[PDB]
Design an enzyme around this catalytic site. Sequence first.
Site, PDB file in Angstrom:
ATOM      1  N   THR A   1       0.820  -1.250   0.000  1.00 19.38           N
ATOM      2  CA  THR A   1       0.000   0.000   0.000  1.00 19.38           C
ATOM      3  C   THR A   1       0.863   1.315   0.000  1.00 19.38           C
ATOM      4  OG1 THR A   1      -0.652  -0.219   2.502  1.00 19.38           O
ATOM      5  CG2 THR A   1      -2.250  -1.132   0.893  1.00 19.38           C
TER       6      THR A   1
ATOM      7  N   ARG B   1       2.498  -4.301  -5.296  1.00 21.23           N
ATOM      8  CA  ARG B   1       2.628  -5.353  -4.292  1.00 21.23           C
ATOM      9  C   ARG B   1       1.535  -5.307  -3.235  1.00 21.23           C
ATOM     10  NH1 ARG B   1       8.042  -5.537  -0.607  1.00 21.23           N
ATOM     11  NH2 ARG B   1       8.878  -5.911  -2.723  1.00 21.23           N
TER      12      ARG B   1
ATOM     13  N   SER C   1       1.121   2.963   3.374  1.00 19.10           N
ATOM     14  CA  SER C   1       2.062   2.825   4.477  1.00 19.10           C
ATOM     15  C   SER C   1       3.285   3.716   4.211  1.00 19.10           C
ATOM     16  CB  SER C   1       2.475   1.367   4.666  1.00 19.10           C
ATOM     17  OG  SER C   1       3.527   1.010   3.795  1.00 19.10           O
TER      18      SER C   1
END
Lengths: 222, 198, 198, 204, 222, 196, 196, 233, 212
Positions: free
Chosen positions: A1, A19, A129
């Site tokens: 993220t 990913r 993130s």
Amino acid sequence: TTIVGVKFNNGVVIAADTRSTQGPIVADKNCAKLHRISPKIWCAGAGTAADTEAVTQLIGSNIELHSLYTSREPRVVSALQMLKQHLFKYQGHIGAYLIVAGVDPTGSHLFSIHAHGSTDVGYYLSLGSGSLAAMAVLESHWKQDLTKEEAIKLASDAIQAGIWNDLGSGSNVDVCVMEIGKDAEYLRNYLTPNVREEKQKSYKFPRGTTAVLKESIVNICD
Amino acid sequence: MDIILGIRVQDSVILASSKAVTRGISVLKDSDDKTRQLSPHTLMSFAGEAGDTVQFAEYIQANIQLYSIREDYELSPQAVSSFVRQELAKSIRSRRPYQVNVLIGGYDKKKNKPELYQIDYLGTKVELPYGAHGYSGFYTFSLLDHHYRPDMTTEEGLDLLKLCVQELEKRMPMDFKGVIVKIVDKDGIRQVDDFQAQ
Amino acid sequence: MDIILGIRVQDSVILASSKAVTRGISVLKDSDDKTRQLSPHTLMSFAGEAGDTVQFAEYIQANIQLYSIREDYELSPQAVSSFVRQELAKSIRSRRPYQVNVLIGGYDKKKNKPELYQIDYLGTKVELPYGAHGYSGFYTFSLLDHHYRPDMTTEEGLDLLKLCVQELEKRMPMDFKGVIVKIVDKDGIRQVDDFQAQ
Amino acid sequence: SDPSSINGGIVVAMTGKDCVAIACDLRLGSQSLGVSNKFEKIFHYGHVFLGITGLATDVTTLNEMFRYKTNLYKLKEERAIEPETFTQLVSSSLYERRFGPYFVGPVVAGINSKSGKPFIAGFDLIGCIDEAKDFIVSGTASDQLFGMCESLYEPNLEPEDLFETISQALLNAADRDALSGWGAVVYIIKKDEVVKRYLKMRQD
Amino acid sequence: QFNPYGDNGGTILGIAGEDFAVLAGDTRNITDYSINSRYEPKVFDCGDNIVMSANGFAADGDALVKRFKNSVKWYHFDHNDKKLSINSAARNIQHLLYGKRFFPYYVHTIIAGLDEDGKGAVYSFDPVGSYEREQCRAGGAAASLIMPFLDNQVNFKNQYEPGTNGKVKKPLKYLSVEEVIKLVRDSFTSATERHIQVGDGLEILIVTKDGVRKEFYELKRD
Amino acid sequence: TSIMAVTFKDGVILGADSRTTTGAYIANRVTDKLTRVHDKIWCCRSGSAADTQAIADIVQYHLELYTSQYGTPSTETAASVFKELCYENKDNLTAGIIVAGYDDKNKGEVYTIPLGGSVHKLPYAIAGSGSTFIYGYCDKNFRENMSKEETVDFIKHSLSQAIKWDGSSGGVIRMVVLTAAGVERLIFYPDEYEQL
Amino acid sequence: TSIMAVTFKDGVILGADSRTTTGAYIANRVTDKLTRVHDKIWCCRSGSAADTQAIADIVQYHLELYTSQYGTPSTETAASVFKELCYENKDNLTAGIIVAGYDDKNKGEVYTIPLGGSVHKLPYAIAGSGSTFIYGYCDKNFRENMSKEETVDFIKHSLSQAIKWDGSSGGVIRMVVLTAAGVERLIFYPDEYEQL
Amino acid sequence: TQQPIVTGTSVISMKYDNGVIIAADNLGSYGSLLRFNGVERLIPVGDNTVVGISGDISDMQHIERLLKDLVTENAYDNPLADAEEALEPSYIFEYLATVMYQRRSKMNPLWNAIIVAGVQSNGDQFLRYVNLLGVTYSSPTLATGFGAHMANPLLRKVVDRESDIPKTTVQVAEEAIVNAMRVLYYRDARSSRNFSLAIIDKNTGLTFKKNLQVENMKWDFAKDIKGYGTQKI
Amino acid sequence: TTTLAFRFQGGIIVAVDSRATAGNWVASQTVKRVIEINPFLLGTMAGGAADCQFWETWLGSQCRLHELREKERISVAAASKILSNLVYQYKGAGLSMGTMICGYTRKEGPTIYYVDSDGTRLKGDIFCVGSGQTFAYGVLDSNYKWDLSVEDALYLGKRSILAAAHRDAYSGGSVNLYHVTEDGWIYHGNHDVGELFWKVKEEEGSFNNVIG
Ligand SMILES: [Mg+2]
Ligand SMILES: [Mg+2]
Ligand SMILES: [Mg+2]
Ligand SMILES: [Mg+2]
Ligand SMILES: [Mg+2]
Ligand SMILES: [Mg+2]
Ligand SMILES: [Mg+2]
């Protein structure tokens, strides 16, 4: 993220890695965090995957129904308002943060919605993130009025930031571009920095290594 | 938990089920049948939560008997167990689940062969040669894995089972007050009432 | 908990004590004596926490035997039980208490009469005609309140007790695997080993 | 306090040059106690295949629910359900119950009867779609599977070889997972013909 | 309250070659979703031709090693520089490790070397003391991704002789060091691809009857 | 969070920062915390993000609907609308919200609908994460109504010190001038207020 | 709780309220929060009652003992003494404590030993339950050193507003003048500060 | 166990061709409050070392004392104390680490994230982390708590690896490290504007560049933002 | 884990599995669960690896001291008692461990003492401890008799442990076998369960339900 978005002199661009984690494990080496709401309005979303998708699917679904009926065209804030009215109606229970962006018959647009109903606006937004690395990159290399080239170059180099210094993100880069008069181009994997090197040995097994107890030829149709 | 066993053999099925009933400390009845014949050739032993148990059984029983006179044709062990599992599947996500485990023994007349289905309260079904819910398996499963043969006579099965019991007694903490045993076959159901003098 | 009984009669005392040993699920030994003769005429049955139990008993034993050869004179049931209570009294406010309950049966030679003292782990003593620690009392105490007479023969006692047992079996959830019985009298200690064939 | 981890089981699939494969173990048991070794996590609806891991009843219920719906599809549309289509469906289905989720881990795979293109997918208990071009793994030993697959997958194997690879992948990861085993079975899907095989393994 | 423990990822590996021994383990170091150092060695020579490594919680780790490297030194002082037979070192470590039984060292530790006959030897440790003579063990985060593999490749687990039906298991044979290191690198790459806490680089200490060799190979900075 | 609204001779003007924090991090250091419900009726949001945002949306709706039938609405007529929303749901809402509006007749009014739902017409109100240090200044340095430019300073310095001691509140300053004239959109860049 | 100490041209003077609250009740609305350790060294206690009280007693002891052998001690020499006590026991202590003292040579010094034990020499410090609203005034209305009477006002008005918005702190004001001259014991009754 | 009261935010650092750098604003927070606008977070030890501390001030002040107090302790009976025999960075740190550990090992730590920087007599660069947990690591780049998440990124664009240090000019190091310092102030509530940077070059030596401001910021564009979605006018 | 030991006409028989396990994943199948305390004694391994392993070796030392002092073989009872006392010293601290201490002395004859972290000392003729203790007690109860061919005793042990291995997920790997006599113990090698199973089902005919 790890995702971002940046509008230039004649449009806006959003990018996201490829990913998808799962605690410490990598589930998909190639996922598209970039979804189409409508031809000109698209989204990038982080947090809870199934939430982010289904939700745009829903909204894209309605907005289509709308434009048709209205015979006009999809406005960006229409999408925004739709999202955050439903989105918050479920007080947080639907983790989905995202950078909504597109272009309507009145300008280029870019916003960021949190999972609770919060919406913001600026010239560039990062969610995920590694939202910090890619934030730091844009907070030193940003100047008003950038071009299809300047902006692009940047967005992709912001994403790159997260891909490297942050664990929860990696593999390739996804990009999409909306120009105030022109179409929209979906560039699945504009980049490919991470590529596994050629392995050392060849692991193909010699036919008949596996022990079999029974076998047959299962049925299908009537 | 209680004791619920079952074993499929040659041309029949056998169900064991302890007799005692406990309320925290004292033991009320100790000659209690945890059984409930669903149809002439189908039968079901059970163990579970105090109230949940006896209600559910009868309820299942009701539906069947209903179906069976309505149609006038009897329902197959296979299909029966399918429905029971259906009901529990819902039950588990209901505002209040019936916490109950079961064994279903029947003689499929069309195939002329005996079938035995084990099913936990979560709605987990499986056709088996033999089974036991709860802690009951741990103590016995081995002996069965050992001596069991598909061809065993009805008698052969009893002996085996009898041995499993002797064990359960020997190493189980709880006093289950013995067992009631029953057989389902092409003739229907009968009770090995003799397992007291035997 | 386990089973610990004791009953004082005519010119003796009788101690019952279940035989099984449990580790959560399985039952290890089932022929285990929860006894420990302290001196020729003193004896102590016990039940309690797994480790706490067997250590404490032997420890108490040690002290006594010590005193008994040092002095060469034997110690009285009364005094013995006093000491045991002492130790537990301290034990309870120790950094770690020995959680253990006991029955102490002895024959006071000076008075030429049998004494029986029940004592819980808190350091609570009492001379009694009969007793039982834990849940053991509940099931039996009545029958004793009923049939007990101070004058009963040694045999009379056994029958009584035997009946209390038959009951404990009938209404107790747990399987205690039977009982070991023992008698303390003017002659000393002997074991009614016969209570298997009896 | 995890449901998925109560019954056990795993499922894995791979895409070969012009075909696919999918295998699973056979064990079913409440935590420690093993119960069955004839419990299969793979079925199909005409030419489409589905492997499901996770909680046992939920698995069964799903199969039933899908057999049901595919029958009803093929009926009004006079044609069997297509892979890509099925995916999108089982996807939505999982979500409809997003607040009383089914504790499972599906994996779809098949061959499209028009394009002739091999297909594979995986999802989390709520319907998130994992489109892959190599392999899919779900179940207890998820992590052990990725370790095998990552080494063994080779783009475009011959069906006869792919079998040997997947077999070994499954088979070996299964032994380092305490909650899976007791036999396994592998299917090989060609344009037409399909071969089912059970293999020999440790029974502990 | 205060939490006295932490995880810094890492994965190490030990294989007992016929007449050698390897102790490999990457160079990454982590905290939450962040990075600490691209390069940070976890494998060391402690003299007497003995390698060690303790993965789990750095601090407890390096302290143990340090605490050990000193206990080696002191062994020589009291016994006239007698060499520490690997077996001995381990019995020693057990104690050290067991010293802190009720406040353990939060780590899986491994050593490797050679016995009093020249045979390779590895030793796996419990976080409090149980040691086993292993001929092959992977410890660390990725553990469960490599152990299944070596199972297969190193011991040919589940591999039979073709045409024997499934009656003849394929015989073990002992591979040269070269052969081993090929396996090892492959193991780690595969692991890095699917594990976030693993990547960056790989440092290998090879033990043989004339010293310690070190070879490094770069992994992906995913 | 750091907001307020002050009344004077030509009406009233409300101002606030731009800083919004998720934990010790800055989500969007450029927030338009000042919000418009009606042409001559605005408000400054305090506390919860998502909540405050949605409240407004609803209100904006009620009013823009009120007018289309009952003419143009008061400033008091507006407060009550928040009263309802805030009150009824006090359990799932976090809002400090300050309201302000002007009407030629009654001049400009200031009402504060703090947490709980309690409403207040004060000379001026101040809420938000860093309101806590201007209880000293504000009250003490407050003359009854001032001039356009004269007032702009209360705002300016009140707001300045609040940044100086409260990290959760910062960024730039933004004012909204509500007068007979109309609406005026202000903005006072950093290097300014710090100097003072 | 509401204390502080300010330095200027003739030295430094520290002042505080009298109000001490157990819950929402006033235990002793007439507290001598200003405390003497040495002749030209005093302090104002913040936070916990019982603790602060005892700390002082000990310190007073150390110093009154220091002198008897090492001559008269500094103001820094005193702070460090609290540093030790405060620190070592941070776990069973609640103390905001501000220290102040004067010496002809280095003028008067102001040190604050807040919770935790961290020490600080500032121009002037302010701690106590109601310090929170004078971060606006104090800092802003602060000229570098003033006059005896000139300063007495900072104290007076800083302290006044703190009562006006913080119930846990009130009562009368009390000042302690530490100068070349000596110690002067002040006291400003209610009807005064309120008027301002 | 315990809890932190006053808090120093980040401390960023990196190496270059000649030596190393280490910055850290001068703010000591009391929760959400900023009760201390000008506080020193860089203790230089000897003249070849400096220590950027981040965490509890009360604890940080203790260490300072341990340093000065250890320093004055090296002198004691040793003439070469200003040349041959004198504190190298590697030493202090080693001793420091030793301490931090005993502490966590005694269930009572010092709430701190610490960086040791300087240059070895023999000319080598030194840069190593060490926190309350007694954990450590070298790296071309290093930042405490808040840093590493936001600073490290940019600092790694200058030096992706150890193979770039040789070609990392003292000036390129500086400006970049300050751009980083501007960013830390752009998105972090715990940060201050004033600060203290220090350089330790094997040629020039120690250069404590205390108290500076963070200049050049793009804020103008603020005026262009209105509402959060609809609010136009 | 599944360990067990029993007494008989020829002495003592000890049998173990070898599967260590962390959560759901198998950490090792190469576990030595029989602590060769010394040439004449053995301790099994339930509870927690390190505790059994450590203390039981500590115990082995302890014997050597006694023996050398007395010029006599230390007797099982004592050996066991000691371990117990040492363990009790730590009741409460968190020591977890089940274990059979087996020996055959000059006087005592064959003798097993099950011992645990709770201070339970227990003389016995049959013991099973572990996860699989339940299934193993099955095979054993039925099939045990005191006059076993020294070889049958060995076989019973294998098979018993084997039942557990099959079913108890947390148990398995390979079986270890030891026999004990008046002159010391003797190892009877390692047996991969995988291979063995297939063999038994074959010869013994048992394990029908299993396919293939
Ligand atoms: Mg990364
Ligand atoms: Mg998984
Ligand atoms: Mg397995
Ligand atoms: Mg040696
Ligand atoms: Mg601020
Ligand atoms: Mg007051
Ligand atoms: Mg098993």
